[PDB]
Amino acid sequence: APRSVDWREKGYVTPVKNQGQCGSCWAFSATGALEGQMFRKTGRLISLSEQNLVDCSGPQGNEGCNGGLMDYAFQYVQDNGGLDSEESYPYEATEESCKYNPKYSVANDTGFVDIPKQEKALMKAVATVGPISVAIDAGHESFLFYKEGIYFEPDCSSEDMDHGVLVVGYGFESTSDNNKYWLVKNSWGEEWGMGGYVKMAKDRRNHCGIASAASYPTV
Ligand SMILES: *C(=N)C1(NC(=O)[C@@H]2C[C@@H](S(=O)(=O)c3ccccc3Cl)CN2C(=O)C2(c3ccc(Cl)cc3)CC2)CC1
């Protein structure tokens, strides 16, 4: 794999979004991954509707503003035959009745891939596929108040993840001893972290469980 990857530079990544008070992180992680795979497929970067996922993917096991799984979202898109654009089905940050309209479907998927649970497998996936949906342990105050640089939290769990985010690349800082990072897009708006991103510790024993539940949709 290359030493550094950043899919933002290749046009695969929409601007940072804000989920608000709704427990819809999983929906933002899923749309991020699908936005990337749709761009690879078609050359068109189109922002997708998290609201459509929040309102409509109960049958697949998602729980709206009270949590869900990226893979359940990918299964919904396959079952449903599509997913609306953000423009057509805008984000409300509350769970409402399903308003899916196939006329405005701009994405599809044919399933999903679960990546082996190693950072080396995650790097290979990121290098070759595009942005990847990942689960992390975000449940430390150090994450809430993260501002810049490489995020490392000694008490992070590699097994107890509670937040879905999107890996858009990886790289290394030239500063000192521990310099590698995953580039991670969050859904807490641009005023959190580094314009809404967190450079997360890479190759330090699967820190925060970033390689523990990584996946992406096939299109
Ligand atoms: C996001 N605003 C909130 N977090 C979740 O909804 C997270 C997302 C995923 S995860 O990425 O943590 C994860 C964890 C373990 C294994 C795979 C994955 Cl993808 C699940 N989330 C959860 O909070 C849990 C969950 C799981 C399944 C359902 Cl239907 C609801 C909730 C508790 C694991 C909401 C804060």
Swiss-Prot record:
Disulfide bonds join 22-65, 56-98, 156-208. Zn(2+) 4 binds at residues 92, 96. Zn(2+) 7 binds at residue 162. Glycans are attached at residue 108. Zn(2+) 6 binds at residue 160. Zn(2+) 2 binds at residues 50, 86. Zn(2+) 5 binds at residues 137, 140. Zn(2+) 1 binds at residue 9. The active site is at residues 25, 163, 186. Zn(2+) 3 binds at residues 71, 114. Residues 176-177 form a propeptide. This is Cathepsin L. It comes from Homo sapiens (Human). The gene is CTSL.
